[PDB]
Amino acid sequence: GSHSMRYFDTAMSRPGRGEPRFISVGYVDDTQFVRFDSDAARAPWIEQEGPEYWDRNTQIFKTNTQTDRESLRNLRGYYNQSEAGSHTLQSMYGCDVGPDGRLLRGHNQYAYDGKDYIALNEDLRSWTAADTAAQITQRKWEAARVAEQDRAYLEGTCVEWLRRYLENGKDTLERADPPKTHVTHHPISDHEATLRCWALGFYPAEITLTWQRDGEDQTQDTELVETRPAGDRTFQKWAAVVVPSGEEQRYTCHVQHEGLPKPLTLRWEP
């Protein structure tokens, strides 16, 4: 099907405790495949890449570390901040491709202290700046033709390496694992009970779990936990509704997931 490659980069200053820590983590879909960490004292399909690959990536990481360190200094200035506080620069970049491996779209965006700062537009040619500080960055990047370089990476390197990773990791990356599901029932009081619909062991993380009553969505009355990692590549999620005792059969749990031959409809089975 369709796939993505995304890097999630975090630089954080720590005045009095050395230079800012830089970490970059790479993913294909919901699978982490590499991690670079400036404080350091990878996936199986990536291990086959060898020395040319690692040296070049290690080299790029070191240079990026230098650059993000000077960016942090500049950002402190743009916002009139003292040298005493910790600050965070983040970026997310990568590409989405279709089943045929062609570029669907590229991404390169940045945030400072948790707030959107600047992003490359979908056209891969212009920027959207969040505020007057980011407008200075935009000015600089327009002058230095940065979008052209980022576009080259996104259209070229990103798509070409995503294709290779998918080929090398096809047995896992191209495999969707369907959820294992069940419905549990717990009395709350004499007059109410909780019905909880479980989805376990699924990959990728994307899933839809809903409760219906008489076929109408119970969006407001459903408690839905955030999808959470099991630790073994797979994910988990549940949705719960409180229902009047005796009315359990008016409620159905619906599950949509890529790994399922077809959508599930589940009911409590006493």
């Binding site: 890097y7 970059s24 790479g26 670079f36 690959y53 990536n57 790029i60 990481f61 240079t63 990026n64 650059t67 993000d68 000077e70 960016s71 500049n74 950002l75 620069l89 970049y93 390169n108 940045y110 700062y117 600047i118 960055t137 600089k140 990047w141 230095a144 940065v146 370089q149 980022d150 990476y153 390197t157 990103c158 390496w161």
Partner: peptide, 9 residues
């Protein structure tokens, strides 16, 4: 594969 940062912010 990592992208090199083109220019400081």
């Amino acid at each position: 594969f990592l992208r090199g940062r083109a220019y400081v912010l």
